[PDB]
């Protein structure tokens, strides 16, 4: 689709069989999901935001479906206020910003 | 233009004759720039995201040119780590997300 920015660009994503709401976010380098359990190996990382830094767990090569499109890539999990699809996954599903 | 997301979508802005570099951020409701003296009355505001909240000064009716497009609106000014164009102004320049 083409998505207006008059409202937040929220989409439904599916990960590990769960449905979540996530924000398509060109201002995020990575995809960051609210605290949740994922299988497999992970590494701790610190990420920065508008207000400071948070601790996250980095999981690699995780399948996710984003508003119809299969992607497989890295997911950070931690105390984000909203689920965020960042540029790493936006590029995988073919998303551009157009004006 | 059609902006791909392989790298951060950083653009030149012009505001009161000053050239700055800013990030096109579909995950920001509002535009927030690094401290700058702007003309007119301002009100204190708190804006939040990953890492918590920061205090800013809200100015209104501020003209700003983003990649050749003219806008006018609310600009927040504060200790953001990076200059951020949010949806308020991305809408004015006609921006959509496309995939």
């Amino acid at each position: 689709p083409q998505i207006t920015l008059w409202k937040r660009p929220l989409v439904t994503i599916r990960i590990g069989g769960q449905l979540k709401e996530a924000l398509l976010n060109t201002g995020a380098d990575n995809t960051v999901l609210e605290e949740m359990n994922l299988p497999g190996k992970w590494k701790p990382k610190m990420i920065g935001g508008i207000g400071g830094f948070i601790k996250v767990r980095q999981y690699d090569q995780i399948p996710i479906e984003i508003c119809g499109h299969k992607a497989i890539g890295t997911v950070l999990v931690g105390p984000t206020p909203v689920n965020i699809i960042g540029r790493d996954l936006l590029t995988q599903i073919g998303c551009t910003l157009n004006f | 233009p059609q902006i791909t997301l392989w790298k951060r979508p950083l653009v030149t802005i012009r505001i009161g004759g000053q050239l700055k570099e800013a990030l096109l951020n579909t995950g920001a409701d509002n535009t927030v720039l690094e401290e700058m003296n702007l003309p007119g009355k301002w009100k204190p505001k708190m804006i939040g995201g990953i890492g918590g909240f920061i205090k800013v000064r809200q100015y209104d009716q501020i003209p700003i040119e983003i990649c050749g497009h003219k806008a006018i609106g609310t600009v927040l000014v504060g200790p953001t780590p990076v200059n951020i164009i949010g949806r308020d102004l991305l809408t004015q320049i006609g921006c959509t997300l496309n995939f």
């Binding site: 990575n30 960051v32 935001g49 965020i84 | 990030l23 951020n25 995950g27 939040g48 780590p81 990076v82």
Partner: peptide
């Protein structure tokens, strides 16, 4: 909250 800027590790 309304500004979801995020910087890689």
């Amino acid at each position: 909250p309304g500004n979801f800027f995020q910087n890689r590790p």
